[PDB]
């Protein structure tokens, strides 16, 4: 039974951050997450402001921003609130629980302070979730687990993927979904976000593989497309965002009915 | 056919960074890596200077330093050059090649500018290495691949571990060894570094598991112990560093002859 995003936002077991996301996706007719892979704060903020109305989420790698400051993140939060999107830091935590707690809370980035969502690899065991959870829980944050990767040679397959799904189910108080190439859980309260998405066929020279919105959302049953270069490399990033938005939304509509 | 660290440093296929590390290990009679998990630059620099004579390597998590600057790294390098230890940033890269490249060279940390060694998870496939290599090779750096983890429920086992070893052998121009719990390659050009080490049996509250230096170096055939809290939490950190050094060094001597 396929439910709309709006309905899924009202599921009994839904995390408040997931419900906030699903509600705005429904309101704005977007299941597009912009992967804002830029190195300048000015470009990041200009993108967030211009594309804000077209996206449900903005994915960051703050560790590549050459002029990061917490004030940059303050201005980002302002735009997120104004245009209604969540902020997802793609930190891909992959260390023991005691370490990731500090990497999430502390340092120069203070990620937990501005990021609605973060994600984690499951290779260290559930301790990685337990550690992030100690920080994220009171702050009403959520976490995505990396069940599959988009890159050539990915070891996130078979039993590895299954362990990711189990770990998510076992920590549903904080884990709100997956980074994956397709649906991996049948529980509707879990979000599926998919990177490796472009309108055109291809990859890059460093192992990335691309599939289309239609394939990923329609055929593979994912919820949200994550798109970097497909948008960022366009001359007009707003036009490109709209293109990806309409693709992903219609693919979702067709799956519904 | 086991060779001393001094002999391994001279092997024809040895990477320069590994050779430099092996020679100072022999000179100083230390196969101890200090895990300097502190949140203040002052404390990082203090520990590095005080414990420098006892260690072959200092392992950092620069993303937990509340007051990182590149000047703090310039100074760390001064101490490293004075006391003769390498700097290892335990960044645990786990993203696609295109992204890790920028995370290694760029952002606020400029890791590649100051870290002799970094490490990477193998889960994304070999693109994670090819990306890092593009930055590391020009800068004369080395990389360790994460073949096994110390934590409860680690998925870095069996075929995953084998994939890590193959990935290393196929990228021997940049990969100089492994993060592992035991010897996983029979090639003497590769280093093995093992975290999860304490004199006493135990673990932490978030999935860390500990084995002793004698078990890890002696029985399991690893080269270098990585120790954080075992030293930092002791009342006398110098005496603590010396106990771990002497344990690890004696275990190496006994295995050798
Ligand atoms: C994360 C996990 C994964 O499996 N694949 C990925 O590509 N990523 C991150 O998503 C973004 C893809 O951007 P693009 O290829 O559309 O430009 C990127 O930031 C990568 O780190
Ligand atoms: C990295 C990989 C691994 O498998 N296990 C690890 O513990 N780590 C890192 O090593 C350090 C262990 O420190 P301690 O438990 O001796 O204090 C820590 O920095 C962890 O991130």
Q: What is the DSSP string of B135-173?
A: HHTTTT-EEEEE---SSTT----THHHHHHHHHHHTTTT
Give backbone dihedrals phi and psi of B63, rounded to 5 degrees, phi first.
-75, 0
* Closest residue, chain A, to B163 (C-alpha): A155
Provide the residue ranges of all domains of chain B, joining segments of one domain with +. 1-257
Whether A118 and A143 have beta carbons less than 8 Å apart is answered as yes
Looking at all shown ligands, the one closest to residue A144's CA atom is: 1
Angstroms from A3 CA to nearest CA on chain B:
32
A150 appears as a binding residue in the annotation? yes
Give B227's contacts (C-beta < 8 A, 6+ positions apart). B32, B33, B34, B35, B197, B198, B244
Whether A69 and A92 have beta carbons less than 8 Å apart is answered as no
Whether A206 and B98 have beta carbons less than 8 Å apart is answered as yes
CB atoms within 10 A of CB B235: 6
* Closest residue, chain A, to B97 (C-alpha): A206
Tell if the CB–CB gap between B151 and A125 is shorter than 8 Å.
Answer: yes
Q: Which atom of ligand 2 is nearest to the CA of B204?
A: 15
Tell if the CB–CB gap between A124 and B95 is shorter than 8 Å.
Answer: no
Q: Look at residue A119 and give its three-state secondary structure.
A: strand
CB-ligand 1 contact for A234 (6 Å cutoff): no
Q: How far is the CA of A196 from the centre of ligand 1 (A)?
A: 6
Q: Which of A92, A97, A152 sits opposite B207 (nearest CB)?
A: A97
CB atoms within 10 A of CB A12: 5
Residues pairing with B178 in the sheet:
B145, B192
Distance CA B11, CA B24 (A): 15
Catalogue the active-site residues of B.
Answer: 90, 92, 95
- Which residues in chain A touch residue B127, judged by CB atoms under 8 angstroms apart? 151-153, 206-208
Q: Look at residue A78 and give its three-state secondary structure.
A: helix
CB-ligand 2 contact for B37 (6 Å cutoff): yes
DSSP, res B200 = S
Angstroms from B71 CA to nearest CA on chain A:
15
**Nearest protein CA to atom 1 of ligand 2, as residue:** A95
Active site residue A95: yes
Class of A1-257 in CATH: alpha beta
Distance CA A43, CA A51 (A): 12
Question: How large is the C-alpha radius of gyration of chain A?
Answer: 17
CB-ligand 1 contact for A213 (6 Å cutoff): no
Give A189's contacts (C-beta < 8 A, 6+ positions apart). A8, A11, A13, A14, A15, A18, A172, A176
Q: Which of A107, A124, A150 sits opposite B151 (nearest CB)?
A: A124
Interface residue of A43, A118, A206 to substitute, partner B, most B CBs within 10 Å:
A206
Task: Output the CA torsion sign for A134, A135, A141, A146.
Answer: negative
Active site residue A67: no
Task: Output the CA torsion sign for B111, B36, B18, B199.
Answer: negative
Q: Look at residue B207 and give its three-state secondary structure.
A: coil
Tell if the CB–CB gap between B123 and A96 is shorter than 8 Å.
Answer: no
For chain B, first and last CA: distance in Å?
11
Q: Look at residue A57 and give its three-state secondary structure.
A: strand
Q: Which atom of ligand 2 is nearest to the CA of B227?
A: 16
CB atoms within 10 A of CB B45: 17
Distance CA A40, CA A43 (A): 5
Tokens of A152: 């050539």
Q: Which of A94, A109, A153 sits opposite B126 (nearest CB)?
A: A153
CB-ligand 2 contact for B195 (6 Å cutoff): yes
Give the determination technique.
X-ray
CB-count burial class (<10 Å; 0-12, 13-18, 19+) for A9: buried
Whether A87 and A60 have beta carbons less than 8 Å apart is answered as yes
Pairing state between β A209-210 and A202-203: antiparallel
Q: Look at residue A213 and give its three-state secondary structure.
A: helix
- Per-residue CA distances from A229 to A36, A87, A118, A180, A220 (Å): 9, 18, 21, 18, 21
A252 appears as a binding residue in the annotation? no
Tell if the CB–CB gap between B126 and A163 is shorter than 8 Å.
Answer: no
* Closest residue, chain B, to A69 (C-alpha): B108
Q: How far is the CA of B69 from the centre of ligand 2 (A)?
A: 23
Distance CA B214, CA B219 (A): 7
Q: In B196-208, which positions are buried (b, 16+ CB within 10 angstroms) versus exposed (e)?
A: bbbeeeeebebbb
Please name which of B206, B91, B35 lies closest in space to residue A125, comparing C-alpha atoms: B206
Distance CA A150, CA A178 (A): 13
- Which residues in chain B touch residue A95, judged by CB atoms under 8 angstroms apart? 90, 92
- Per-residue CA distances from A56 to A29, A115, B48 (Å): 9, 14, 45
Q: How far is the CA of B206 from the centre of ligand 2 (A)?
A: 12
């Amino acid at each position: 039974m396929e439910l709309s995003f709006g309905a899924r936002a009202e599921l009994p077991r839904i995390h408040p951050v997931a419900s906030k996301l699903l509600r705005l996706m429904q309101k704005k007719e977007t299941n597009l997450c912009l992967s804002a892979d830029v190195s300048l704060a000015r470009e990041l903020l200009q993108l967030a402001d211009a594309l804000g109305p077209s996206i449900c989420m903005l994915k960051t790698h703050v560790d590549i921003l050459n002029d990061f400051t917490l004030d940059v993140m303050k201005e980002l939060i302002t735009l997120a609130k104004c245009h209604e999107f969540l902020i997802f830091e793609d930190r891909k935590f992959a260390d023991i629980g005691n370490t990731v707690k500090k990497q999430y809370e502390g340092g120069i980035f203070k990620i937990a302070s501005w990021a609605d969502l973060v994600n984690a690899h499951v290779v260290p065991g559930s301790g990685v979730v337990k550690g992030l959870q100690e920080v994220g829980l009171p702050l009403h944050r959520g976490c995505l687990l990396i069940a599959e990767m988009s890159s050539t040679g990915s070891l996130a397959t078979g039993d590895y993927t299954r362990a990711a799904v189990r770990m998510a189910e076992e920590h549903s108080e904080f884990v709100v979904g997956f980074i994956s190439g397709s649906r991996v859980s049948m529980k509707p309260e879990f979000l599926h976000l998919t990177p490796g998405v472009q309108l055109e066929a291809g990859g890059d020279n460093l192992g990335q593989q691309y599939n289309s919105p239609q394939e990923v959302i329609g055929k593979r049953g994912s919820d949200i497309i994550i798109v970097g270069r497909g948008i960022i490399s366009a001359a007009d990033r707003l036009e490109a965002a709209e293109m990806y938005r309409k693709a992903a939304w219609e693919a979702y509509l067709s799956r519904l009915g």
